[PDB]
């Protein structure tokens, strides 16, 4: 009910990062940076506010992500001078996936390693439901160039995180919104049928079945690819002794 | 000091007291009671289900809104109570599903009502990309494990069709993954130092690890040029059939 700013932070969490930046769209036309701060003025001070008055949307950075998530629920679809403000988390411009993490790698060892290409805001080695590592990681930098450095250096180079000499793999993080998704308000031939199970003997069944048989050979063939890739890697694992 | 003040503002339509506002609460003092647990989270409104494991030590508590359980998470995690230091996290989801091969013109509400034929859906979502286009994937979250197993089972046996186009959806079990909390330093023996005595660095060419790392690299090079043949080979058959 009543939050103490100046005491509202997850441990280690950094302030005014790209993760606590908001996209505020479907804006009124007379909107200014001054009025932007006014809407979010209860969430404490805000960092940068960039407002594309031509496109009718803008950005504002808050202190912590939870502050922004609070804001996002209090101000989404909020009516402002005729239009309904849409409020979402902004895309991360320097987010990176890391595969082939070793063990005894930790959120901190990652932030330490990747810090060599620029300022890291966050780095987390993703853990399964049993608390163990998956081999995947997240590394979010302060700005684009540090991620283009990290991306490029780790593709041409061989970046080893531990004594074990299998280098890590580094790809850009796909910026997908899996909270709001696609509502009906957005978006007739394709709807004129309901969700149903394709019934045997029908035309739609036969096509469904033609598709599922094509996924089969696609899986069978992929399976032979990652089968001998697996055992080649596996051979390699042996010779290290 | 400066503050924020809220009240009772939840979106309409959004379901409440789902698995997604359930907090795991660990490191409990052994004399913890339910009555005392609710008083603890009473800042954040009346709470739904409260569980306390038999040997005390940990429990769970449904809050109303995911965003409400966020606020309680950061204000109460690491909080001392009777000397112990509470670990607050979100509990896992026991009834979560990813769906692939979605047809176009599917929405959160359609997906939701589609999969209700198997049980109580609490959330559906059509994952979109950076330009707000559907991604072809989606999440379906049920309230109970039996519903999500039913939706799994009936969707590998049959061809579930969400629109008129006869391309059946693919329905897999949501891999439970923590990209929020990860594996901190404090949560990690002897091979530990075997492994951690080389700092992060690049392989220096002409070294017993550069030659090895190159091998690991050449296998990635193969793996990719081989999957492309398959991509090639399948995309040809895919078009034919269509
Ligand atoms: C996903 C996850 O973190 N799990 C799976 C089961 N639970 S839970 O926290 O998801 C959960 C279970 C029941 C419930 O309400 C009745 C709410 C939440 C987990 C957990 O915390 N248990 C610890 C555990 C048990 C067993 C194993 O391996 C055999 C590992 C961890 C963990
Ligand atoms: C990249 C970015 O800042 N966004 C966030 C706001 N929206 S979104 O609501 O579609 C969204 C997509 C992905 C996501 O990942 C976390 C979060 C939100 C975006 C958006 O609509 N950008 C404007 C735009 C400009 C041009 C075009 O051309 C098709 C489309 C959209 C993306």
Notes on the structure:
Two copies of one chain form a homodimer. By secondary structure, chain A is an alpha+beta fold. Chain A has five helices and twelve strands. Chain A has a domain of 78 residues: Alpha-Beta Plaits (2-Layer Sandwich). In chain A, strands 3-4-2-6-5 form a five-stranded antiparallel sheet. Chain A has a four-stranded antiparallel sheet with strand order 8-9-7-11, with helices on one face. Strand 12 of chain A pairs antiparallel with strand 11 of chain B, so a sheet runs across the interface.
Concise summary:
Chain B: There is a cross-link at residues 7, 43, 46, 73, 137, 145, 194 (Glycyl lysine isopeptide (Lys-Gly) (interchain with G-Cter in SUMO2)). Chain A is of the alpha+beta class and 241 residues long. The first copy, chain A, has 5 helices and 12 strands.
Beta-strand level of the residues of chain A, as a percent range?
Answer: 15-25%
- In terms of quaternary structure, the protein is homodimer
User: Which fold name is given in CATH as the topology of one domain in chain A?
Assistant: Alpha-Beta Plaits
CATH C-level category of one domain in chain A: Alpha Beta
Using a beta-carbon cutoff below 8 angstroms, give the protein chain pair with the largest interface and the number of residues from each chain: A-B, 104 and 103 residues
PDB class: rna binding protein
Keywords: dbhs, Paraspeckle, Ligand, RNA binding protein
Assembly: dimeric
Entry title: Structure of NONO bound to (R)-SKBG-1 in P43212
């Amino acid at each position: 009910l009543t939050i103490d700013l100046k005491n509202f932070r997850k441990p280690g969490e950094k302030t005014f990062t790209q993760r606590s930046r908001l996209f505020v769209g479907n804006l009124p036309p007379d909107i200014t940076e001054e009025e932007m701060r006014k809407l979010f003025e209860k969430y404490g001070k805000a960092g940068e506010v960039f407002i594309h008055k031509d496109k009718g949307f803008g950005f504002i950075r808050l202190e912590t992500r939870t502050l922004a998530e609070i804001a996002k629920v209090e101000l989404d679809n909020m009516p402002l001078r005729g239009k309904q403000l849409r409020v979402r988390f902004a895309c991360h411009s320097a987010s990176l996936t890391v595969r082939n993490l070793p063990q005894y790698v930790s959120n901190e060892l990652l932030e330490e390693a990747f810090s060599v290409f620029g300022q890291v805001e966050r780095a987390v080695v993703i853990v399964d439901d049993r608390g163990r590592p998956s081999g995947k990681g997240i590394v979010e930098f302060s700005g684009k160039p540090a991620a283009r450095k990290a991306l490029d250096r780790c593709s041409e180079g061989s970046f080893l995180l531990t004594t074990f000499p299998r280098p890590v793999t580094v790809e850009p993080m796909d910026q997908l919104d899996d909270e709001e998704g696609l509502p009906e308000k957005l978006v007739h031939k394709e709807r004129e049928q309901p969700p149903r199970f394709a019934q045997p003997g029908s035309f739609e069944y036969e096509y469904a079945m033609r598709w599922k048989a094509l996924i089969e050979m696609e899986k069978q063939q992929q399976d032979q690819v990652d089968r001998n890739i697996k055992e080649a890697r596996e051979k390699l694992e042996m010779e290290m002794e």
